[PDB]
Amino acid sequence: PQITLWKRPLVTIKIGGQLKEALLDTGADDTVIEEMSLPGRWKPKMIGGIGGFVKVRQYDQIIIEIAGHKAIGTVLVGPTPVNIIGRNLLTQIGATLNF
Amino acid sequence: PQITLWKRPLVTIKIGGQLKEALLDTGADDTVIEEMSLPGRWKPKMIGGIGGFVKVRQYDQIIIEIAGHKAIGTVLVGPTPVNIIGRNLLTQIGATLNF
């Protein structure tokens, strides 16, 4: 689709067997999701933004379906106020910013 | 342009006659820039980022060029890790996300 930016660009994702709403975020390097369980190995990580840093768990090689488009990559899990799809997965679905 | 997301979508902005680097950020409701002098009055605003809430200074009706496109709108000034162009100004320059 072509998504305007009058409102937040929220889409439905499927991750870990769960449907969630997430923000398509060109300003986020990395995908970050609210607390949930995911399978496999993980390691701790700190990510920072406005407000400072938060501690997250880094899970690699996780499959996500974003608005119907499958992708695989790293997913960070932790206390984010909103689920965010960052560039690491936006590239995989062919997302571009156009003007 | 059509900007892919393999690297951060950084552009040049011009504000107050000065060139700066900023990130095109679909996950930001609002444009937030690092400490600088802007004309006129300001109003208080709280914004909530990934690490919590921060106070910023809200300046309205500021002339700003974004990758060569003219915009006039609200600019927040405060402790951000990078200058961010949010949806309030991305809409002014006609940006959409496409996949």
Ligand SMILES: CC(C)CN(C[C@@H](O)[C@H](Cc1ccccc1)NC(=O)O[C@H]1CO[C@H]2OCC[C@H]21)S(=O)(=O)c1ccc(N)cc1
């Ligand atoms: C500040 C950016 C350089 C980085 N961020 C992405 C950014 O899009 C966040 C994404 C975001 C969105 C909502 C809540 C928290 C974080 N937006 C944000 O902080 O925007 C603020 C300015 O406008 C307001 O509207 C939204 C919050 C305010 S971030 O959330 O801190 C972040 C940092 C690292 C990763 N991997 C993922 C996300």
Ligand SMILES: [Cl-]
């Ligand atoms: Cl990845």
Ligand SMILES: [Cl-]
């Ligand atoms: Cl590509």
Ligand code: NA
């Ligand atoms: Na894994």
